[PDB]
Structures are given as structure tokens and as C-alpha cells.
UniProtKB/Swiss-Prot annotation:
Protein's UniProt keywords contain DNA repair: yes
Cellular component, GO, one term: cytosol
Cellular location(s): Nucleus; Cytoplasm; Lysosome; Late endosome
Phenotypic consequence of residue 108 to A: Impaired binding to USP12
Record's miscellaneous remark: Knockdown of WDR48 increases Akt activation.
Effect of residue 159 to Y: Strongly reduces interaction with USP46 and abolishes stimulation of USP46 enzyme activity
Record protein name field: WD repeat-containing protein 48
Organism: Homo sapiens
Domain remarks: N-terminal WD region interacts with TIP and C-terminal region mediates lysosomal localization. The WD repeats are required for the interaction with deubiquitinating enzymes USP1, USP12 and USP46.
Family, as annotated: Belongs to the WD repeat WDR48 family.
Length: 517
């Protein structure tokens, strides 16, 4: 096996708004709900009743990296999600909780596809594999009915960035960095064809109801219409300056709604593409779009970008079209810059609202908000003339501070108690290991780490606690996420058992056996 690393996220208990871009959207027309799939790793449910003052319904937390795609299914009862954490999760979409986790992919899961008539979902990723999933089987998973059955489709020589199935469940198409569309019959798993034409990655796929026609969107800047009967490209539309990443098509299959790197969203007539309408220029690159299908013609389009806000643009008056969004779902700020001071303890950040903050990595918390001060000059001002060896790495993928601890350098940093801002019961100044202290705090609630007295049990490190809502994550270096939980839930029956299964020996040594190195 690979090395197992420990990670945690510095955040608030509720992250009501997306903290980074949004990769995918789904509408529940029945309940008037929108689901957003966050690059902050969180799925959120929103009310799209414009009457409502606050559209927030719920956060669906379980993934530990980008949620790249989602499929609402079973009359809105079930959500399936795909993530850069390598897993595909099954959720009760009405109640908003994770029911199971599928770990068959070896790498980032990039795309889902859905056949509504068969309630069949497919998942594809950077591992070049496609798996088919009967959702009604998946939702029937009891603890006794442990086993689940999946078939796979092979053929992709490269990483898969797009997947689509027709409504009937008779055609499935993948798009990849191979620059080709690969087509299978999902009933037989048989290779049907391989379609050439694109000169770059294929990022978006759409199929008509019959699975006879396909629209593809590519990084080469083109949209292509393919006939699967003739096994060829019948049309190529060039309506964008840069890569096309998101596509929708109306129910009649006559107009394509497209967006990507250049921010312009077009509604192009597929029969005469000289008739095209710029719906809007969006404030950032468009990642995904979801049509409102509550009427024909479609009244609006929901748009997801690399920013955290999600906008609804109306399409009425189609005969830039509109200046401002019709409906807006507020976005949170992403931390976009991070500086680790020479103490290897404090960090200064700047976010997308230009607000600057000072954080304590060891205690997993903010120290102060400085507001909109000069970021580079604040770094200079707070310069510390000390050396402390590196003992963690930082990453801003989620728009939040994620700290990772690795066996190789977690224990490198020793600091005196009084230099660290602590003291002992009897005026002492021992040497403390920062990583050792931190691991004990993250697993403070795990009863296997507790020590009975010589009245009150001794928990954690003796000097500080992390915030109890802090997510703690165990993962394979450059591999699969194994287990996630909140710090305060390690005492739970299932949580304790999974920590026994997942917490690696190098953490066990310090936290359970108390052998601070």
C-alpha cells in the first residue's frame, strides 16, 4: 500500500455558501430545488422560489475534494456524486445525507451520465474506466445485502472528461484527452464506434432521447454534431474563441446553449448557426449550465462558473441579451493566497474579497481578520526571524485552508513550550513536537487515545484543543481518500471502528501508545 496522510480543514461549522467554483448543477422541478456541486467539496441544496428571502436549504458534506459532477434521479429522491477524492457517493437527496460510498475508481472521478428511463448511472474518471450502476440496486443496499454488481466499459486510452447516456439507456458516450468520442451499448458493454474530429479534449456531451445524435464540446473551441447511425460528424460550430466546457440543448434539439473559457454564453440555432444570441457575458469561465425546463421554450438557464456565486439568466425576449442575472445564489470568498511564516505555525491569507486574515495552523483556527490591508506589506511587517523545519503542507483547492501531515516530516518541528505561548503546571519549559501535539488534538475524542487518571480522563495534548467541528481526513498519498469525520465524532461506534481500520501506525505511536518521538 501507499503512505497514509492525515489532513484537516480550517473552517466554520457551517459553510453556507460555496467557498470556490461550482462544477455541476441539477434541478428538482417538483420541489423547486437546485443542487450545486462545489469545488469546496460540498454539495448544497437551494430553493429556487424567487419569493423566498434566503434560498439555503442544506449542506451535503462527505467528499474531501472537488465534487466534479452530480445526477439527481429516482424522482429527486437520490443524488449520485463524483469527486476528485476518487469516490462515487449515493445520497438521500430529500433528507441530504450520504447512504454509501463506491470506491471502484482508482483516480479522480470526473463525470457522470444518466439514463432516466432505466434509472442507470455511469461514472468515469482519470483512471480511464467507466462503471455502470443500477441505482435501484444501489438504494436497496442493506447491511445484509452487502454485495453490489457493476460492469465496466474499457477502450479509453486516456483520461475521461465527459460522459453521456441517452434517456432510454441504449447508448453511452465518453469524451477524453484522446480527442475522440467512444461509444458503447451499456446493455451489452460492447464497443460500438470511435469518432474522430476534435483536435483537443472533449469536455461536454449531450445525446438526444434515441441516442442517434450527439453534441460534443471541446477545448479546441468547437461544438460538434455527430450522427451515430452514419458514425460521423455532420456539423461543426465555431462560436467561441477558447475551449467549450458546458452544453445544454432544448427539448426539441434545435438550439445549443454553450459556454466555456471565454465567458460568453450563446444560444446557437443548430440548423443555421449564423442565428446566434449572446445571452450574457458571465463574470468568469463557465463550467456547467442547467436549463430551466418548466416551459417550452425554456424560460431560463442556471450557470456555474469558477466563482462561488450561481446565477439564473432568463431567456425571455430571445427574438448581450440581458444585463444582470434574474436570480442570484450568493457565493463565499475563496482563499487564493497563503503565506507560511518562518515559525511554521502562523499563516497569512488573502481571499477573493481582498480581506486578509492571520491563522494558527497548530490550533486550527483564525487569530484575527485584518480586513483589506496590503497583503504583501502585511507579510513583511509580520516577518519572523526564526528557523523551524517544515512539518506540514497547505493546499487551497477547496477555497479553504487544508493542511496535510505526512509521516516523513510531521515530526520535524520541536519548539520550546514558552516560545510556543504555553506553560506547564509547575513553571516548566519542555520541548514540544508540533506535529505530535497536533495529532493528539485531532484525535482527542477517540477513546483509544484516552488515559485514565491516578476522577477525570486525560485527553489530547494537555496544551490546546482544535475546534470540535474540524474535519479530519485520512488518505493515501496521491491516492484514494479512506475516511473522513469531524473531530468531535471520534467517540462514535462506527467512527471508532473506522479509525482502528484507517489510522496508520505512525499516528498510533503518538496518539494511542504515547511515544512522542
Amino acid at each position: 500500500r501507499r503512505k497514509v496522510q492525515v489532513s484537516y480543514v480550517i473552517r466554520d461549522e457551517v459553510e453556507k455558501y460555496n467557498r470556490n467554483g461550482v462544477n455541476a448543477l441539477q434541478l428538482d422541478p417538483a420541489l423547486n430545488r437546485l443542487f450545486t456541486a462545489g469545488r469546496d467539496s460540498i454539495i448544497r441544496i437551494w430553493s429556487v422560489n424567487q419569493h423566498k428571502q434566503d434560498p439555503y436549504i442544506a449542506s451535503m458534506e462527505h467528499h474531501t475534494d472537488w465534487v466534479n459532477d452530480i445526477v439527481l434521479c429516482c424522482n429527486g429522491k437520490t443524488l449520485i456524486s463524483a469527486s476528485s477524492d476518487t469516490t462515487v457517493k449515493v445520497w438521500n437527496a430529500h433528507k441530504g445525507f450520504c447512504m454509501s460510498t463506491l470506491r471502484t475508481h482508482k483516480d479522480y472521478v470526473k463525470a457522470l451520465a444518466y439514463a432516466k428511463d432505466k434509472e442507470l448511472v455511469a461514472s468515469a474518471g482519470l483512471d480511464r474506466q467507466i462503471f455502470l450502476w443500477d441505482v435501484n440496486t444501489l438504494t436497496a443496499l442493506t447491511a445484509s445485502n452487502n454485495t453490489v454488481t457493476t460492469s465496466s466499459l474499457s477502450g479509453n486510452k486516456d483520461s475521461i472528461y465527459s460522459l453521456a447516456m441517452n434517456q432510454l439507456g441504449t447508448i453511452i458516450v465518453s469524451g477524453s484527452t484522446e480527442k475522440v468520442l467512444r461509444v458503447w451499448d451499456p446493455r451489452t458493454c460492447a464497443k460500438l464506434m470511435k469518432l474522430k474530429g476534435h483536435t483537443d479534449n472533449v469536455k461536454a456531451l449531450l445525446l438526444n432521447r434515441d441516442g442517434t445524435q450527439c453534441l460534443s464540446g471541446s477545448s479546441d473551441g468547437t461544438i460538434r454534431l455527430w450522427s451515430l447511425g452514419q458514425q460521423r460528424c455532420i456539423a461543426t460550430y465555431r462560436v467561441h474563441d477558447e475551449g467549450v466546457w458546458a452544453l445544454q440543448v432544448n427539448d426539441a434539439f434545435t438550439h445549443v446553449y454553450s459556454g466555456g473559457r471565454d465567458r460568453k454564453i450563446y444560444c446557437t440555432d443548430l440548423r443555421n448557426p449564423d442565428i446566434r444570441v449572446l445571452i450574457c457575458e458571465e463574470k468568469a469561465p463557465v463550467l456547467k449550465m442547467e436549463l430551466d425546463r418548466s416551459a417550452d421554450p425554456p424560460p431560463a438557464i442556471w450557470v456555474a462558473t469558477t466563482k462561488s456565486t450561481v446565477n439564473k439568466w432568463t431567456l425571455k425576449g430571445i427574438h448581450p441579451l440581458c444585463t444582470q442575472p434574474d436570480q442570484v445564489i450568493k457565493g463565499g470568498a475563496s482563499i487564493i493566497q497563503c503565506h507560511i511564516f518562518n515559525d511554521k505555525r502562523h499563516i497569512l491569507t488573502k481571499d477573493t474579497n481582498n480581506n486578509v486574515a492571520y491563522w494558527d495552523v497548530l490550533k486550527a483556527c483564525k487569530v484575527e481578520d485584518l480586513g483589506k490591508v496590503d497583503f504583501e506589506d502585511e507579510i513583511k511587517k509580520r516577518f519572523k526571524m526564526v528557523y523551524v523545519p517544515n512539518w506540514f503542507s497547505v493546499d487551497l483547492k477547496t477555497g479553504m485552508l487544508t493542511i496535510t501531515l505526512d509521516e516523513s516530516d510531521c515530526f520535524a518541528a520541536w519548539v520550546s513550550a514558552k516560545d510556543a505561548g504555553f506553560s506547564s503546571p509547575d513553571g516548566s519549559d519542555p520541548k514540544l513536537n508540533l506535529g505530535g501535539l497536533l495529532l493528539q488534538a485531532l484525535l482527542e475524542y477517540w477513546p483509544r487515545t484516552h488515559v485514565n487518571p491516578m476522577n477525570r480522563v486525560q485527553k489530547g495534548n494537555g496544551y490546546f484543543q482544535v475546534p470540535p467541528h474540524t474535519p479530519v481526513i485520512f488518505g493515501e498519498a496521491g491516492g484514494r481518500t479512506l475516511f473522513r469525520l469531524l473531530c468531535r465524532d471520534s467517540g462514535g461506534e462506527t467512527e471508532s471502528m473506522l479509525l482502528n481500520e484507517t489510522v496508520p501506525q505512525w499516528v498510533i505511536d503518538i496518539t494511542v501508545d504515547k511515544n512522542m518521538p
